[PDB]
Structure 1
Amino acid sequence: KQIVVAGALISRGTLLVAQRDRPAELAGLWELPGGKVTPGESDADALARELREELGVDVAVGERLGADVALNMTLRAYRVTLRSGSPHPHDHRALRWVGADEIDGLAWVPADRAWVPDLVAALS
């Protein structure tokens, strides 16, 4: 199982979500950003690397958020917190900061939908 990590970045009381740009089936839909773990990397090292490339930030990787999602690979989310930088959509169509009440109305990528109740809880 190839592991894919995702980050739930909470800052000043809101969650960062990222709007995919590709492929066509996901372009326009929202996700927790991240990517594949390369063999030899820890989950923390992979997620920090992905978020530095995608968002231009240095984050600290914390506790898991929610459960694994079986894509077929397996997707796991972690809480992350900002160390330096301000996020910009280098690899996404857009970013947004959302509160608890916005989470269930967002047009999530299908895999991430499972985390809705966990994200609401984390913001509540």
Structure 2
Amino acid sequence: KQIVVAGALISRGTLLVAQRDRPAELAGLWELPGGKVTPGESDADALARELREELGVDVAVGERLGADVALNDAMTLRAYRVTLRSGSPHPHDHRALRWVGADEIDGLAWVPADRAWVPDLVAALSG
């Protein structure tokens, strides 16, 4: 399987979520930002690269957040906790970003794959 990595960036007690702009089926729906691992890259390399490109931030990649998600035949989607090293996130590829708290998680219009992590994200923001 091709691995797609995604980041749960928690800062000052809130989670960053990113509103996709493409393709039509997902445009307007919310995700943890990330992207495909390239051959030879570690998950950490890939996720840090994607978030630098997508958000303009330097992050440190930490523990897994939740379980793998079967995207399709070809792909598996993995989330990791990430934390900010430098920069402020801006939507270079996305329609919008938002900082959300625990009680906003389950009401967001998630992209279908990522919705699996809702309980994990609520827990990560709870307490």
Q: CA deviation at 1:59?
A: 0.1
Partner deviation per Cα, 1:78-114 (whole Å, 9 max, x = no partner): 0000000000000000000000000000000000000
Q: CA deviation at 1:24?
A: 0.3
Partner deviation per Cα, 1:29-55 (whole Å, 9 max, x = no partner): 000000000000000000000000000
Counterpart position of 2:17: 17
Q: CA deviation at 1:57?
A: 0.1
Q: CA deviation at 1:61?
A: 0.1
Structure 1 stretches of 5 or more lacking a match? none
CA distance in 1, matches of 2:39, 2:13: 34
Counterpart position of 2:96: 94
CA distance in 2, matches of 1:71, 1:94: 23
CA RMSD of aligned residues (A): 0.2
CA distance in 1, matches of 2:60, 2:71: 25
Q: TM-score, normalised by structure 1?
A: 1.00
CA distance in 1, matches of 2:19, 2:71: 19
CA distance in 2, matches of 1:14, 1:41: 29
CA distance in 2, matches of 1:59, 1:5: 14
Q: CA deviation at 1:4?
A: 0.1
Identity of aligned residues (%): 100
Structure 2 stretches of 5 or more lacking a match? none
CA distance in 2, matches of 1:70, 1:24: 21
Counterpart position of 2:64: 64
CA distance in 2, matches of 1:25, 1:75: 18
Residues 17-96 of structure 1 mapped to structure 2, 5 A cutoff: 17-72=17-72, 73-96=75-98
Q: Secondary structure at the match of 2:65?
A: strand
Q: Secondary structure at the match of 2:114?
A: helix
CA distance in 1, matches of 2:94, 2:15: 16
Aligned pairs, number: 124
